[PDB]
Design a protein around this ligand. Structure first.
Ligand SMILES: *[C@@H]1O[C@H](CO)[C@@H](O)[C@H](O)[C@H]1NC(C)=O
Lengths: 40, 23
């Protein structure tokens, strides 16, 4: 059932933002995220 | 910003001037 397909590239999730003059968000938990970056 | 025969082609960018505006 497989095939090769062509499409417009999704630049990201269409993400909605909870703005208000009186609203906020602040975090309570976090990842100490490790990344590799590699250079000649 | 103002702007053929002998084997010469100007290929398109991967990202259109419109998708630049999306990012
Ligand atoms: C905050 O926004 C609401 C509309 O969403 C408005 O009625 C309210 O007066 C605003 N408050 C302040 C302090 O700007």
């Amino acid at each position: 059932s497989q095939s090769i397909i062509a499409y417009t590239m999704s630049l990201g999730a269409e993400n909605s933002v909870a703005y208000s003059n009186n609203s906020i968000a602040i975090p309570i938990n976090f990842t100490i995220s490790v990344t590799t970056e590699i250079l000649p | 910003v103002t702007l053929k025969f002998n084997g010469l082609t100007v290929l398109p960018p991967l990202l259109t001037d419109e998708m630049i505006a999306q990012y």
